[PDB]
Design a binder for this molecule. Structure first.
Ligand SMILES: Fc1c(F)c(F)c(F)c(F)c1F
Ligand SMILES: [Cl-]
Length: 164
């Protein structure tokens, strides 16, 4: 297991424009297109992302290409964020994947309220961190995925992704 296989499980793969858990137009492996309610606006973003006139449908190769870029961009974002870099640097590689997972799903604006969780993770207070992480809109709206990500932070293992 690694961040790519992990996010592939959590995000799935769909080759036509679909709406994510929040109702936003998305494609491929959790590639958010736009928060706009306009499908035409989504299609435009898709064409710009892929570099061709797609009309809402992409190939598996194209989806994986966007996916690699999105994972790369999430990591690069963490490393450029003063509030996230120290915690991320303090973690082992399995828990780093869990961190990248959260940023991929909610962005850096989404993780701004996790200040206390982040402190507990940097302190390696894994059970306490896990309890704090669950006290969130994130956990309530996507409990099954949050539980997997939280178990990864708690244990530093891939146990929550075995069987899947
Ligand atoms: F970068 C992050 C981390 F290193 C974390 F450990 C974490 F919980 C987050 F939500 C992050 F965005
Ligand atoms: Cl479509």
């Amino acid at each position: 297991m690694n961040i790519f296989e992990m996010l592939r499980i959590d995000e799935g793969l769909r080759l036509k424009i679909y709406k994510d858990t929040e109702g936003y137009y998305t494609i491929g492996i959790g590639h958010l297109l736009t928060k706009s309610p306009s499908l035409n606006a989504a299609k435009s973003e898709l064409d710009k992302a892929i570099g061709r006139n797609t009309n809402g449908v992409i190939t598996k190769d194209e989806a994986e290409k966007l996916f690699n870029q999105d994972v790369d961009a999430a990591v690069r974002g963490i490393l450029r964020n003063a509030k996230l870099k120290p915690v991320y640097d303090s973690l082992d590689a399995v828990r780093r994947a869990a961190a990248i997972n959260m940023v991929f799903q909610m962005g850096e604006t989404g993780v701004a309220g996790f200040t206390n969780s982040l402190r507990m993770l940097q302190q390696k207070r894994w059970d306490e961190a896990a309890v704090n992480l669950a006290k969130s809109r994130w956990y309530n709206q996507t409990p099954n995925r949050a539980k997997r990500v939280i178990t990864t932070f708690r244990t530093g293992t891939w146990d929550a992704y075995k069987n899947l």
